[PDB]
Amino acid sequence: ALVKEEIQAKEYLENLNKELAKRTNVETEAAWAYGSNITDENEKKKNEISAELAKFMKEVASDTTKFQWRSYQSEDLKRQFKALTKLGYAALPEDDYAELLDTLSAMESNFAKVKVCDYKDSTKCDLALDPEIEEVISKSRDHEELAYYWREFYDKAGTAVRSQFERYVELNTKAAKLNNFTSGAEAWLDEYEDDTFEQQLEDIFADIRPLYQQIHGYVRFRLRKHYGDAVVSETGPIPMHLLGNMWAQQWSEIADIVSPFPEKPLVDVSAEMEKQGYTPLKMFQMGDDFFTSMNLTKLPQDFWDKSIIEKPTDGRDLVCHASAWDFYLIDDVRIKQCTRVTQDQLFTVHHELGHIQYFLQYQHQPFVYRTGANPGFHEAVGDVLSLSVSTPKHLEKIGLLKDYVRDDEARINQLFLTALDKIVFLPFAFTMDKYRWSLFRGEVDKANWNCAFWKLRDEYSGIEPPVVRSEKDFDAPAKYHISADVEYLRYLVSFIIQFQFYKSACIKAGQYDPDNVELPLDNCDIYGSAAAGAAFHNMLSMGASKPWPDALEAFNGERIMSGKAIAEYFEPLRVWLEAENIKNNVHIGWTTSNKCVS
Ligand SMILES: *[C@@H]1O[C@H](CO)[C@@H](O[C@@H]2O[C@H](CO)[C@@H](O[C@@H]3O[C@H](CO[C@H]4O[C@H](CO)[C@@H](O)[C@H](O)[C@@H]4O)[C@@H](O)[C@H](O[C@H]4O[C@H](CO[C@@H]5O[C@H](CO)[C@@H](O)[C@H](O)[C@@H]5O)[C@@H](O)[C@H](O)[C@@H]4O)[C@@H]3O)[C@H](O)[C@H]2NC(C)=O)[C@H](O)[C@H]1NC(C)=O
Ligand SMILES: *[C@@H]1O[C@H](CO)[C@@H](O)[C@H](O)[C@H]1NC(C)=O
Ligand SMILES: *[C@@H]1O[C@H](CO)[C@@H](O)[C@H](O)[C@H]1NC(C)=O
Ligand SMILES: [Zn+2]
User: Separation of 203 CA from ligand 3 center, angstroms?
Assistant: First the structure.
């Protein structure tokens, strides 16, 4: 009978969770070894342990059928059982699983090992994305130099892994169907536990798209004055290599040439960080300070002992793309970041430490609940702190911003600077998954895979490649997450919900009142707020133990993902910018790109 079975089921779960945590620990150690030191041998060890854990998960899935778990009284027990039924890639036959891991390894190591020749010296051929190419893309205003680095990088990071990417799409699809999802798109979407989630994001995106179009138009206008009309057209998509980022995902690196009020201050603290002797260690210690200032958990000694916070100097290959790692024991949590002393890197440190904090908050949960309420929640945590850190208010307190007068014009400069990171990114992030979903769902023929990518980038972001591409190129894997098989919708979700978290934290901290001109949302610093700290604790400590609306409700009483808060933040910018574009007769919108030939 079922009452007795449910009692035994609870004990089965308790043991199985602990066993999965320990087995995952071992797989994580091997993955860490590889990612911090790419070698054929580390690859082999990583993929071998994953294969073994996959075989165990298959037995676990099979063993859950011995329990009438859908008949149980406990919502909690049923939730855990449901989580253990979901195998993902581990559902594949052993041989196909191994081929998928090999394919994944080939793509991620191709990405991490890209090097290109110096534009001014074709004997010097050891320039990596991080830091060398990224420095040129973010700093050079030589449009031909920029186009050179763009083409070299995309050809090597993108086109070179076409045939591997194709096999990955096939195996990803096969795995999804073995879990009885239509495709990998529905397998990813299942993490949001909401069958209207795509519609909800379309609705929110459509409400913010007008503001994006205004920013796009203004930036295009300013780039024309800088580079001239031979480089940038009034009416066409923006050539993406001029936007300060290899993927045009964020444009804050060209703020100095597009800022609303060039005579008025624009916050860029990198030079002061350098002047005051900041190191990667100091930046992490300051992030730790921020969390503990809010009455959240301090980093444990394992973090300091085992993290990698600067690029190795020993010539090894590694993945430099910044990441946070849970080892699934107690207090073994780590970051791997090739840290540089810049403003944007200070924000990255806070981003990654948000993942760390989450891990620490939920580490007492059962293994299956030791993850984010949804993938977007995980990405949002550290960004809520980065929003504070970026404020003039905070940057003056820590001595990084000197002689700053916050008049109306400085405020618009700062709002615009923020928008170049937070609004511009939204169409970018949506396209990353729209593209992959379309491949996974079998909606695009293989003959059209490259132009289907640039078509989306055109339609949603109004950008295009600097040179003509064709179906001979394959550009999508030039972005880390695409080569590395990391779902990207989490970042779209994060960029919306982080404003709901920020706004609520700010109110709880006494730092935001809509009816008080002294407390605008865009100068809120939650540093030192135990009240904000508490809201985080209430939410993060839940892990994935409840559906994400219940996690949001624990934070601020709401249950709905909403674009209201991000619009509220940028509202003064929207008003100003709409007026400025009219005043300057700025063209809005773009013709269809001709930069991808079929
Ligand atoms: C994805 O969807 C798939 C379907 O599209 C699904 O695959 C199905 O899983 C079914 C559930 O496990 C499975 O059902 C069993 O089928 C056996 C007979 O099938 C053979 O003949 C078919 C031709 O008709 C072939 O096509 C198949 O390939 C098979 O070779 C049955 O013998 C079997 O039965 C036993 O199991 C039930 C268990 O009953 C449940 O459990 C308790 C036990 O206490 C019951 O009391 C309770 O009420 C409940 O019924 C017993 O009732 C029975 O007495 C036997 O012990 C069972 O029906 C089915 O074969 C399979 N079909 C396919 C592949 O098409 C995947 O499982 C889905 N995957 C995921 C990840 O969810
Ligand atoms: C990297 O891994 C290899 C194993 O393939 C090992 O022998 C080598 O010493 C490692 N290097 C570092 C820097 O740890
Ligand atoms: C900090 O959190 C603890 C619980 O961990 C709580 O009891 C205490 O009130 C909080 N301290 C502050 C500074 O509010
Ligand atoms: Zn992250």
Answer: 39
Is residue 352 part of the annotated active site? The answer reads yes
Return d(Cα 201, Cα 17) in angstroms, integer: 33
Task: Give the burial class of 409: count Cβ atoms within 10 A of its Cβ; 0-12 exposed, 13-18 middle, 19 or more buried.
Answer: middle
Check pocket membership of 250 for ligand 3, CB cut-off 6 A: no
* Experimental technique used to determine this entry: X-ray
State which H helix or E strand residue 343 sits in: helix 343-361
Of 343, 318, 278, 287, nearest in space to 138 by CA: 343
CA of 323 to the centre of ligand 4 (A): 7
Say yes or no: CB of residue 213 within 6 Å of ligand 3: no
Interstrand relation of 596-597 and 238-239 (parallel, antiparallel or unpaired): unpaired
Burial class (CB in 10 A: 0-12, 13-18, 19+), 579: exposed
Quote the CA–CA distance of 58 and 92 in Å, as a whole number: 9
Question: What are the sequence ranges of the domains in the chain?
Answer: 1-82, 270-408+510-572
Helix (H) or strand (E) holding 292: helix 280-293
Whether 226 has a binding-site annotation, put simply, is: no
- CA 213 to centroid of chain Cα atoms: 22
Q: Which long-range contacts (CB under 8 A, 24 or more apart) does 478-481 make?
A: 478/153, 478/154, 478/157, 478/158, 478/246, 478/247, 479/247, 479/432, 480/111, 480/321, 481/432
The answer to whether 568 is a known catalytic residue is no
Resolution (A): 1.9
- Provide the residue count of the chain: 598
